[PDB]
């Protein structure tokens, strides 16, 4: 599915991510536009092997399982393709695990490089919430 901004911004909030961790919900919505441009079925292979999947772009090598990225954790207790659906439940759930981690919202290069510092605010601007 490809989300729209605000429909994506919606359905963040009723999961939860609103300030979660003191990250604004237009954090969450400026992440998920650089990582995965709204579409949950995105997938990207790395160098390492390793592959990000879904709306935010969780990696394989800690977080989900792919069965194909060897010596890698399963932390958030998942296949990779849950991440995938269409109902951002379990990308919420695991991205919620993240950010709890210790480098907050650094964890997504694409939050650092492209929204950190920004007026996030803008991408939940004209949205009913
Ligand atoms: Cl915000
Ligand atoms: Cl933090």
Request: aromatic content about 12%; proline content about 0%; overall charge positive.
């Given at each position: 599915k490809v989300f729209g901004r605000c429909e994506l911004a919606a359905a963040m909030k009723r999961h939860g991510?609103?300030?979660?961790?003191?990250?604004?919900?237009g954090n969450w919505v400026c992440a998920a536009k650089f990582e995965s441009n709204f579409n949950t079925q995105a997938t990207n292979r790395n160098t390492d092997g390793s592959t990000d999947y879904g709306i935010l772009q969780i990696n394989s090598r800690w977080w989900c399982n792919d069965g194909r990225t060897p010596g890698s954790r399963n932390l958030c207790n998942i296949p990779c393709s849950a991440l995938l659906s269409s109902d951002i439940t379990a990308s919420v759930n695991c991205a919620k695990k993240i950010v709890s981690d210790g480098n907050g919202m650094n964890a997504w290069v694409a939050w650092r490089n492209?929204?950190?510092?920004?007026?996030?605010?803008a991408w939940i601007r004209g949205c009913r919430l």
């Open positions: 991510l609103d300030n979660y961790r003191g990250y604004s919900l492209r929204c950190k510092g920004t007026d996030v605010q």
